[PDB]
Amino acid sequence: HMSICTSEEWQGLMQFTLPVRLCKEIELFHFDIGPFENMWPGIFVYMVHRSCGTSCFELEKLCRFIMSVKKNYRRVPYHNWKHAVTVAHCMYAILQNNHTLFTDLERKGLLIACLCHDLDHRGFSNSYLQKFDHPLAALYSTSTMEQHHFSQTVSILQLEGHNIFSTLSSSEYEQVLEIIRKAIIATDLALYFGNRKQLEEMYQTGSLNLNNQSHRDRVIGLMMTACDLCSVTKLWPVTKLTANDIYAEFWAEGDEMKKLGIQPIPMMDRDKKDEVPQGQLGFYNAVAIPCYTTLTQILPPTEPLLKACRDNLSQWEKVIRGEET
Numbered sequence: 001h002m003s004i005c006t007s008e009e010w011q012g013l014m015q016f017t018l019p020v021r022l023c024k025e026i027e028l029f030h031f032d033i034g035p036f037e038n039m040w041p042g043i044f045v046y047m048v049h050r051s052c053g054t055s056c057f058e059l060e061k062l063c064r065f066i067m068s069v070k071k072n073y074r075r076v077p078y079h080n081w082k083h084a085v086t087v088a089h090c091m092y093a094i095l096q097n098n099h100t101l102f103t104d105l106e107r108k109g110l111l112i113a114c115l116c117h118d119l120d121h122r123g124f125s126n127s128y129l130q131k132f133d134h135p136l137a138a139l140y141s142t143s144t145m146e147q148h149h150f151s152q153t154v155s156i157l158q159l160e161g162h163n164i165f166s167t168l169s170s171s172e173y174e175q176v177l178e179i180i181r182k183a184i185i186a187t188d189l190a191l192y193f194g195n196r197k198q199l200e201e202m203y204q205t206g207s208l209n210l211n212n213q214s215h216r217d218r219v220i221g222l223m224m225t226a227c228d229l230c231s232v233t234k235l236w237p238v239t240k241l242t243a244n245d246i247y248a249e250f251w252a253e254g255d256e257m258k259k260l261g262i263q264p265i266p267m268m269d270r271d272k273k274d275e276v277p278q279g280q281l282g283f284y285n286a287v288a289i290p291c292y293t294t295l296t297q298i299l300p301p302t303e304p305l306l307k308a309c310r311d312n313l314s315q316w317e318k319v320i321r322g323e324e325t
């Protein structure tokens with residue numbers, strides 16, 4: 001079952017107003033929510049109200065939904081409430097800059113999918129769950145955690161007073177749940193490689209057509225990867241601090257494996273931290289740079305993400321060369 005927020009929590013959120021000085025900052029792709037922890041639920045309400053409107057959702061239901069989602073993120077080093085709001089902010093910046101390409105249903109579904117995309121993450125990878133035959137891997141054979149995050153999103157919507165989508169027609173309700181399911185499953189990095197390869201081929205051959213639902217689904221999937229990996233698009237000190245959290249979580253998985261008698265892969269071994277800069281250079285070359293390159297080709301307003309990713313790749317190269325630590 002899903003944890004539920006308290007009345008004090010959602011009522012407090014209903015009263016929040018964003019300081020006007022932050023309006024200019026929140027619109028920027030490089031915005032880092034880090035320094036504003038108490039404002040994170042309020043920043044999410046602000047982004048939903050800007051993209052979709054103050055009357056898109058019943059305010060009481062939206063505040064209960066957000067505070068219950070926060071309560072169902074766990075105290076893990078990386079896949080936590082901060083990550084959820086960071087990914088939702090990147091989606092907000094992408095949607096704001098490509099507004100007319102997305103329907104009202106898609107913008108509301110994608111912001112909610114981003115806030116919920118790692119719901120109830122336990123700090124263990126799909127690799128761990130599958131290798132050790134965890135019951136989640138029996139229920140969900142592929143994209144294990146992602147299917148769980150979607151099931152948890154539906155469970156929160158089913159809590160009394162939390163169904164923010166109940167006012168949609170029956171056809172739009174089904175459509176928004178499908179947008180959310182596909183977007184959350186797209187955050188499984190195993191699916192990204194094939195998705196990006198298909199999109200690059202569609203773009204290069206001139207067959208990419210945003211009026212085609214299957215092509216829209218793929219573009220949305222790439223947008224979800226771009227948002228999920230957006231710590232690589234922040235200013236260097238922020239990118240480096242988030243990388244410490246990414247590895248702290250993977251090292252705890254590696255420690256658990258060692259206790260269970262299985263040697264972890266080097267990335268998850270805290271005794272192999274010296275290999276992190278080369279691991280990051282590999283991740284940027286194989287995953288991040290191609291992701292933002294293809295995204296910028298399809299959605300030119302997203303170019304700042306690619307520029308920042310390239311800047312951070314250069315910083316990791318400087319670390320390898322001993323110019324930075």
Ligand SMILES: Cc1c(N)nc(C2CC2)nc1Cl
Nearest residue numbers: 229231232246267279280283
């Ligand atoms: C964003 C992100 C991510 N999801 N996973 C990694 C693995 C340690 C390589 N690095 C980054 Cl930078």
Ligand SMILES: [Mg+2]
Nearest residue numbers: 117118145187
């Ligand atoms: Mg995830």
Ligand SMILES: [Zn+2]
Nearest residue numbers: 117118187228
């Ligand atoms: Zn994530």
